[PDB]
Amino acid sequence: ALISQSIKNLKGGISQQPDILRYPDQGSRQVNGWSSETEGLQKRPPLVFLNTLGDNGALGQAPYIHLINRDEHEQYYAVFTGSGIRVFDLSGNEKQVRY
Amino acid sequence: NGVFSICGSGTENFCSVLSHGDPSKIFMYKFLYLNEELRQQSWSHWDFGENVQVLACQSISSDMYVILRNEFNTFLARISFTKNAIDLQGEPYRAFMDMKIRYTIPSGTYNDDTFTTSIHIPTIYGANFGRGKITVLEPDGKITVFEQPTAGWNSDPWLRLSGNLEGRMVYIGFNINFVYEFSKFLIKQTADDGSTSTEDIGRLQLRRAWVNYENSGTFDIYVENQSSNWKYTMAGARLGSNTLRAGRLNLGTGQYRFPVVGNAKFNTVYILSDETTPLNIIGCGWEGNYLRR
Amino acid sequence: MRSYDMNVETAAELSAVNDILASIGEPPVSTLEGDANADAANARRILNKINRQIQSRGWTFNIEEGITLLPDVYSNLIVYSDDYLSLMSTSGQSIYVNRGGYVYDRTSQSDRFDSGITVNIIRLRDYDEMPECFRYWIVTKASRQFNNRFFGAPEVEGVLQEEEDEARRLCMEYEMDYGGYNMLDGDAFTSGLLT
Amino acid sequence: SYDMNVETAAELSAVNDILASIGEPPVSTLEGDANADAANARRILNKINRQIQSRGWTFNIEEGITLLPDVYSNLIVYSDDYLSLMSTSGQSIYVNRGGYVYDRTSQSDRFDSGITVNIIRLRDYDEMPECFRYWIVTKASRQFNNRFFGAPEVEGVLQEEEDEARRLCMEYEMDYGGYNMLDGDAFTSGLLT
Amino acid sequence: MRSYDMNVETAAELSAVNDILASIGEPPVSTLEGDANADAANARRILNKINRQIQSRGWTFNIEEGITLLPDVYSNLIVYSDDYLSLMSTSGQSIYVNRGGYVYDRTSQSDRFDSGITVNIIRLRDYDEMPECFRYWIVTKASRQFNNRFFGAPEVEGVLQEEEDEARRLCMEYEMDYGGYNMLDGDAFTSGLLT
Amino acid sequence: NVIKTVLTYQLDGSNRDFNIPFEYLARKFVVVTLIGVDRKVLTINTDYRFATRTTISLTKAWGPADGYTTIELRRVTSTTDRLVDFTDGSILRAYDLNVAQIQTMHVAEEARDLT
Amino acid sequence: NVIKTVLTYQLDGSNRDFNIPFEYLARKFVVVTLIGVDRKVLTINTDYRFATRTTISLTKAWGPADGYTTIELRRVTSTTDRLVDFTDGSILRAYDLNVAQIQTMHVAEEARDLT
Amino acid sequence: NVIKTVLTYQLDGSNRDFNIPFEYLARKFVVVTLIGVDRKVLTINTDYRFATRTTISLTKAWGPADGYTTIELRRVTSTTDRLVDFTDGSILRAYDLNVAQIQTMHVAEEARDLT
Amino acid sequence: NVIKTVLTYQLDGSNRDFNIPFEYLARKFVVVTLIGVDRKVLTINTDYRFATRTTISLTKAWGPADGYTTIELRRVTSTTDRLVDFTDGSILRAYDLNVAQIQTMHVAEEARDLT
């Protein structure tokens, strides 16, 4: 009966809902994709290593990080580790914390 | 279970969450809110690789800076969402790789005894890595992959390249994994106000199916049906077309057809790609008999 | 009916299952064992039942010639299991029909006897141990049955039917060559007459 | 462009032509595990290959042959390799009860010194006269077509050409067997004397 | 099967490829060489395979008369390459069938021999070296095959079929004229009888 | 009173085949016997090749000339071990589920049958 | 520490498994010649059925009593059937190009080994 | 032990045709030989016109009357040059990709074959 | 022999020179064997220097008076490592394809020439 259906949009995310219910244009388990407007799934955008901050342990213990965008000109990331205030500049140069 | 942060951004629309339980992954929800259409509500799940904890996702507008903690050290990196750009200067093709760094191979390395050049993971990258595949890329395409010693990269810290490579602008990297799984290919039909009435009644046996690639390289479509797992890789371009000229990048828009035979109800086709070439899929079409029971 | 899944592993049976399944469109099954998919099992059953039917129409290879069923001395009763497809005597007007599980004399009116009997039986055999022409006939007849029951396909059926007719043509020719009775040389009526 | 005699893989060429029979792109090599559509090619080719070789032809059949009895037990392994077991003259006794030949008349399976039979042994898809090879290719192509992804017109043209190719084989066989109605066969040779 | 890319170039082959392609609607191809388009290559293959098939049905021109295959003295084994389409002996009831790559005696049961043999073989030839009537028959049969495989056209096919039948009519007439055996003058049975 | 287990078939002077009418969960289970002077048991590879699943061919022509007049095929599906064990994580299936009820049933029936 | 094309397995003792040292692309490649009396190849399926990737089990390890003194395990490349070859339409799964060099490589390694 | 390369065909008193069963990447490669008193080689345009790709016709009837009894056709695909070179910018294609694996394979096989 | 792979150079009483006919793509492959009584394969820097592309030198003044009498340089190209391995999606580098033919070519030539 040559039923041909073309799901031509893609995107739409995932759904763990059942198959009769799942809407078209959805799938299960997209991983690693940014589904934008014109391109369909694209591999998620890439990352560039900028700096190596510290030991897995030293910044460790579930820290809270707030990104201070001071100005378009300087951006500093601040990590409040459980013990103390450590601030890493966007480039990773450690602007020092004093108390 | 516990969402530490729900960072979000205005100019690209990426709402996100990171957690104690599955920390390896940031999950991104992409929304277009024109009017109240919310045309697309999509929850997808990103990954940063095995054994990795993502400490924070906060977004300077138009990109985001993510602090990943390897099991061994910690890294700060920037993911650029700009639509079609070469991230690092001089890159052949917006290479998608987990850490992309540029290193000019130094004069000291290379051996007259072994025609290999030695790179040091602790040195060229800032700190020792943990686990995963590594790919080195010459500016012209010649992606070469050195699989992880099962030892762990920290345990065996030297990786090699072959040929004297006194000088290069190698863009080194850890590989990225894409998996999107199509929805079991059930017949779906449209109805009033976007109603879907996928028809359970009946057996659809689907003879062949297609994915319409655009601007993309290796993507491998693994079709598995119950009690079987088949791979139908697509790479390059058809030999003999003007496209596979030697010495050239090889990425061109085309349609691949994968043959899948079976009862749709239990067969899944998932596209999995892993080789640093962008993969873009515009559309998928399943063609099949469907005579109702 | 012997069990559909009790039959052990095989390679020829595997070819067959894969082929029958192929006809309704299922992909080849890697190992006939450990396969969760039900279709596999349903097909296996169809191959087994149709294997029984084809064998039942007597074929020269299968009909055992006079063989002996030996009576249980303590029991005084010949046993008649479902492996027997047919019980026909050698001379004419066979007199044996199975009553209960046991064979039974319809003339003497007593299943109880001794000294054994001679009968031309049609024994069931596995799907293997059949000649290559018949295996091909069975696979296609089973494929046609399977296409009727599960899929509803109109076209495949016509092709399958012509193919099965072709196979029958081929098999009945093989069987005839195997038996090979020229009417002049072999007869009961004329072997006597032509001397 | 220059005078080459290099030979392309013969077995692979078969499944390659089967694929290209339906317009599917040619497959470089039979490895890769999946290529399920290609895999079916191998399976259906070899199977329909046994099929054609079963129907006896005067060149597949070996006119006489002794199979050694297993010395230890006197049971001759009746493999799946042999297609058909048939005696020399008439009323072929042997048929396999179990995996070894069992003589129906004898009521015995073991026997010493072996036997003489006319067997049609399995051969590769290769090693067949070209007419048979093309016939096998077109028949496998028609099956692989109308089973998995059939279209109306290609099936019809293919079955037409397939019946035509039968004639290419049956003609070939007749000349190769070259039987004579009078001189060649036994009943009439005697009459001539 | 010799490589589809073994004919070095051929102006006649070029005409043919262009014509076959024309039938499914492709435009004439300027130079058969350097052409990226795949269709070209697929067509070339169809022309080569169908060239092999047509030749295989014996034609009077092709069948070599008794020719000699000479055994390798060191080897003691005649070689049987895929350029041989058929091996038939001169007298009757040919006794040669290829076992492995090598030719093989099915009577003596040994491929090993010497002193050579005489056989009426059907040798494969290039697409060129065929008479002009057969070239025309091949081009159209190849065009019909190609129209089935790539396009799905209903009409072209009917015309192609009638044309191919017309060509066969023409070719079998040419071949008959070339051989030209009148039954009275040329016979094995009656050349003896009419004296 | 139909005893379907212990069937004894008259031994004959020259027959090497007897047909096991009753069922077997496993081969090892059916044990042949020879009788008339004493009970002499037999071993499957040694003397009684299983032929078709439903028939046993006894080599070395056992017969009344030996002085042995009876062949008995008897079923003692063994009680000691569960042929089927549903270990954790199996895909329970037909062979497994049916055999376990059956083992008992065949064995108990043997108990019921001799008496 | 060569991946010798040939490993000498003295045919003595019994182990279904004698470990091959070469790496074999497919079954057909390996040939076992039985030195000791007649250099001989067991049908790959009939005696040396390929029980394993790095070991082969002939049904029996032939005794010195058989007198087959030695077994040779070899990986010899068949020039005639390229395991893999490149044709027009086939997209060049890079994996195939690698199989091809390897198939050639084995023919040559074999060559170094014979000479 | 099937030597498929060095095939020697008996020279005959009056036959000018021998059929090269084995493969050749290029023509220049197969070199004919004549034997029996000494080895006399031959030149393709001069004495052995290649006829059909698969047959060589030797003019000047070489035969045992000369005292020469053997013709040998042997394959020495030449090692020195890569027949196929993938220069920058080519449209890689079937002829090119297949020949390079093949060159080695035919040549190594010659090494394996003489011995 | 004639093709330059194996060499037959004989030990000098004192030598700071050992000449090389062959072209070796990488240094690793050519390995020195001094076979005075039996084989001794010396590593690169510990005994000798591939000091110039053309020539090599080993110290210790290995001499005929001393046990070694054969300084044999034999060109072996390792089968396993190819300067080029085709990664998926890799730009098929033109020069690289050329290395591939060579690595295999050399490996066979070592075999053929040795004959």
Measure Cα distances from A50 to A68, B28, B82, B100, H12 in Å.
18, 23, 18, 9, 82
3-state secondary structure of A74: coil
Where do runs of H (alpha helix) occur along chain G?
A: 94-114
3-state secondary structure of G61: coil
The separation between CA F60 and the C-alpha centre of its own chain, rounded to angstroms, equals 19
Distance CA B116, CA G65 (A): 53
Token pair 């037409």: residue: D160
- Give the H or E element holding residue B219: strand B219-225
Please report the DSSP string for B81-113 in residue order.
--TT--SSTT-SS----SS-EEEPPPTT---SS
- Give the H or E element holding residue G70: strand G70-75
Nearest C-alpha neighbor of H84 from the set E41, G86, B241, D31: G86
> From the CB coordinates, do chains F and A have 3 or more pairs under 8 Å?
no
Which of D146, D149, D154 is the best mutation test for C, with the most CBs of C within 10 A? Answer: D146
CB neighbours (10 Å) of residue H26? 16
Which amino acid appears at position B107 of this protein?
S
3-state secondary structure of H37: coil
Per the structure block, which two tokens stand in for G92?
A: 């060049």
Phi, psi of E151 (to 5 degrees): -80, 170
Helix axes D36-54, D10-20, angle to 10 degrees: 110
Per the structure block, which two tokens stand in for E34?
A: 């350097």
Token pair 């109603």: residue: B195
Residues of chain D positioned with their CB less than 8 A from the CB of F48 = none
Say whether E101 and G89 touch across the interface (CB within 8 A).
no
**I92 touching H (Cβ < 8 Å):** yes
Quick check: B118 and B153 in contact, CB under 8 A? no
3-state secondary structure of A29: strand
Distance CA B74, CA F74 (A): 74
> From the CB coordinates, do chains I and G have 3 or more pairs under 8 Å?
yes
- Give the H or E element holding residue C173: helix C154-179
What is the per-residue burial (b if ≥16 Cβ within 10 Å, else e) of E41-80? bbbbbbbbbbbbbbbbbbbebbbeeeeebbbbbebebbbb
Torsion on CA atoms H63, H64, H69, H70, rounded to nearest 10: 10
Distance CA C54, CA C57 (A): 6
Nearest C-alpha neighbor of B211 from the set B269, B163, B160: B269
DSSP state of C73: T
Measure Cα distances from B48 to B16, B18, B60, D53, D60 in Å.
14, 12, 19, 57, 62
Nearest 5 degrees, angle CA E150-CA E151-CA E153? Answer: 145
Q: E strands of chain D, at which residues?
A: 65-67, 82-86, 94-97, 100-103, 115-121
Token pair 């009837």: residue: H61
Which of H2, H3, H4, H9 is the best mutation test for E, with the most CBs of E within 10 A? Answer: H9
Nearest CA distance, C34 vs chain B (angstrom): 8
Distance CA G10, CA G12 (A): 6
Distance CA B3, CA D154 (A): 59
Token pair 């195939």: residue: G96
Half-sphere exposure of E7 (CA within 13 A, CB side): 23
Which amino acid appears at position C168 of this protein?
R
With 0-12 / 13-18 / 19 or more C-beta atoms within 10 angstroms meaning exposed / middle / buried, residue I34 is buried
Per the structure block, which two tokens stand in for D45?
A: 């080719």
Please report the DSSP string for B250-267 in residue order.
------EEE---EEGGG-
Residues 6+ apart with CB under 8 A from F46: none
Half-sphere exposure of C36 (CA within 13 A, CB side): 8
Quick check: D27 and D114 in contact, CB under 8 A? no
Phi, psi of I77 (to 5 degrees): -105, 125
Quick check: D81 and D51 in contact, CB under 8 A? no
Which of B242, B244, B245, B248 is the best mutation test for E, with the most CBs of E within 10 A? Answer: B242
Nearest C-alpha neighbor of B23 from the set B43, B63, B51, B44: B51
Say whether D3 and H99 touch across the interface (CB within 8 A).
no
User: Euclidean distance between the first and final Cα of chain B, in Å?
Assistant: 44
- Give the H or E element holding residue B58: strand B52-58
Q: What residues pair up with D96 in beta bridges, in sequence order?
A: D101
- Rg for chain C, CA atoms, rounded: 21
Nearest CA distance, I78 vs chain H (angstrom): 15
Nearest C-alpha neighbor of E60 from the set E178, E171, E167: E178
User: Euclidean distance between the first and final Cα of chain D, in Å?
Assistant: 63
Q: E strands of chain I, at which residues?
A: 18-19, 30-34, 40-42, 48-49, 55-58, 71-75
- Rg for chain I, CA atoms, rounded: 16
Per the structure block, which two tokens stand in for G42?
A: 């067991």
Per the structure block, which two tokens stand in for C6?
A: 């009790």
Say whether E38 and B241 touch across the interface (CB within 8 A).
yes
Residues 6+ apart with CB under 8 A from I58: I15, I18, I32, I42, I47, I48, I49, I71
Interface of chain F toward chain C, CB-CB under 8 angstroms: 2-4, 6-10, 12, 15, 18-19, 21, 52, 54, 70, 91, 93-95
Q: Which residue of B has its CA nearest to G86?
A: B239
Helix axes H94-114, G94-114, angle to 10 degrees: 20
Say whether D37 and B259 touch across the interface (CB within 8 A).
yes
Per the structure block, which two tokens stand in for F91?
A: 């895909």
Per the structure block, which two tokens stand in for E137?
A: 């028959």
CB neighbours (10 Å) of residue D43? 17
Quick check: D14 and D27 in contact, CB under 8 A? no
Residues of chain B positioned with their CB less than 8 A from the CB of G86 = 239
With 0-12 / 13-18 / 19 or more C-beta atoms within 10 angstroms meaning exposed / middle / buried, residue B262 is buried
Helix axes C154-179, C132-149, angle to 10 degrees: 160
Where do runs of H (alpha helix) occur along H1-115?
A: 94-114
Nearest C-alpha neighbor of B201 from the set B220, B179, B186: B186
Residues of chain I positioned with their CB less than 8 A from the CB of H87 = 94
Measure Cα distances from E10 to E47, E143, F56 in Å.
13, 18, 71
Residues of chain G positioned with their CB less than 8 A from the CB of E4 = 88
Which of I5, I98, I114 is the best mutation test for H, with the most CBs of H within 10 A? Answer: I98
Residues of chain D positioned with their CB less than 8 A from the CB of E86 = 129-131, 172, 176
Per the structure block, which two tokens stand in for F58?
A: 């006894």
CB neighbours (10 Å) of residue C132? 20
3-state secondary structure of B192: helix
**I84 touching B (Cβ < 8 Å):** yes
Quick check: H68 and H11 in contact, CB under 8 A? yes
Measure Cα distances from C171 to C17, C167, D51, D84, G4 in Å.
20, 6, 12, 12, 51
Which of C19, C160, C184 is the best mutation test for D, with the most CBs of D within 10 A? Answer: C19
Token pair 């069975």: residue: C138
Q: Which residue of G has its CA nearest to I115?
A: G115
Neighboring chains of E (3 or more beta-carbon pairs < 8 A): B, D, G, H
B225 closest CB neighbour out of C27, C31, C150: C27
3-state secondary structure of E31: coil
The separation between CA D58 and the C-alpha centre of its own chain, rounded to angstroms, equals 12
With 0-12 / 13-18 / 19 or more C-beta atoms within 10 angstroms meaning exposed / middle / buried, residue H89 is exposed
Phi, psi of B182 (to 5 degrees): -65, 150
Nearest CA distance, H54 vs chain G (angstrom): 17
Q: Is the dihedral of CA G50, G52, G58, G62 positive or negative?
A: positive
Q: What residues pair up with C88 in beta bridges, in sequence order?
A: C120
Nearest 5 degrees, angle CA G57-CA G59-CA G65? Answer: 105
> From the CB coordinates, do chains E and D have 3 or more pairs under 8 Å?
yes
**I115 touching G (Cβ < 8 Å):** yes
Distance CA H103, CA H84 (A): 9
Say whether D107 and F17 touch across the interface (CB within 8 A).
yes
CB neighbours (10 Å) of residue F37? 10
I60 Ramachandran zone, left/alpha/beta (phi>0; psi -120 to 50): left
DSSP state of B172: E
Measure Cα distances from D190 to C195, D185, D193, E93, E160 in Å.
19, 9, 5, 19, 53
